[PDB]
């Protein structure tokens, strides 16, 4: 046993001034009320498609920690290149 | 001096393994090449070729033709779900597209 990992929330943990705040960094004037659920869905899809490749490189390297270079390598594969962590 | 069991039949495959080992030594991909990689890679390439040719043959029968012309290949890839995601940014020559008309461009009738 010893492992307490019963987690159900944390899609709601991206709260609801936060998507409003991102939208008003984006230059958006007036928002409806279904944008919140749709944004949570799209964020879940994207973080799945990055964490999958991150854990794959971490396993293939035969380690247990996901260092920053592996995240940079996953995002390099995706096409969204990231600078400033190597 | 012994029996020349080629690495195709010694494995149980159909893709050659000598040509794969030559194109992994002479591609400057690494210095040293193992002796499980060209076998494993020949198997992967065979399975993908079988996967597309199954659906190609089904469509080729189902349009009542003998051979396979590339319109069947276009239909066989783009009807499937995972092969379309693999061949993401790919244009097959002489391909054509799926027949698709939107829902509002065609008329409908109300009276009588």
């Amino acid at each position: 046993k010893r492992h307490r990992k019963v987690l159900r929330d944390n899609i709601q943990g991206i709260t609801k001034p936060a998507i409003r705040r991102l939208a008003r960094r984006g230059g958006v004037k007036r928002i409806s009320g279904l944008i919140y659920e749709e944004t949570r869905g799209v964020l879940k899809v994207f973080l799945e498609n990055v964490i999958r490749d991150a854990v794959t490189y971490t396993e293939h390297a035969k380690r247990k920690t996901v260092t920053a270079m592996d995240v940079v390598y996953a995002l390099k594969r995706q096409g969204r290149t990231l600078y400033g962590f190597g | 001096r012994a029996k020349a069991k080629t690495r195709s039949s010694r494995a149980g495959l159909q893709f050659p393994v000598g040509r794969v080992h030559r194109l992994l030594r002479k591609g400057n991909y690494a210095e040293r090449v193992g002796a499980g990689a060209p076998v494993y890679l020949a198997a992967v390439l065979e399975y993908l070729t079988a996967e597309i040719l199954e659906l190609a043959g089904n469509a080729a029968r189902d349009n009542k033709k003998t051979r396979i012309i590339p319109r069947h290949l276009q239909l066989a890839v783009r009807n499937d779900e995972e092969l379309n995601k693999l061949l993401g940014r790919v244009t097959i020559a002489q391909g054509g597209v799926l027949p698709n008309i939107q829902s509002v461009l065609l008329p409908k009738k109300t009276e009588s």
């Binding site: - | 690494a30 494993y40 051979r67 995972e82 995601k85």
Partner: protein, 94 residues
């Protein structure tokens, strides 16, 4: 007399007659399948070579090819191609 060139025509012929008895193939379809296998080979060998440079090793084993296939192919097709590869290698050993 011309200089001998590579092609994968005969092996597509053999797999086609193993999976369909009486269904031929054209010329253009053969060129498409040739370029398709060339594409998949280039992508997988590139991913394995990049893994080998990341891990500070120098040798393509089978392990890197398995990792490259698990990365590049989407989901269930990867879960079948891994089994195909492992079965072929284990029938090659003994």
């Amino acid at each position: 007399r011309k200089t001998r060139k590579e092609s994968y025509a005969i092996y597509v012929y053999k797999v086609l007659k193993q999976v369909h008895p009486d269904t031929g193939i054209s010329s253009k379809a053969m060129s498409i399948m040739n370029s398709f296998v060339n594409d998949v080979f280039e992508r997988i060998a590139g991913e394995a070579s990049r893994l080998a440079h990341y891990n500070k090793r120098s040798t393509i084993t089978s392990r890197e090819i398995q990792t490259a296939v698990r990365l590049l192919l989407p989901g269930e097709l990867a879960k079948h191609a891994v089994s195909e590869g492992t079965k072929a290698v284990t029938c090659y050993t003994s």
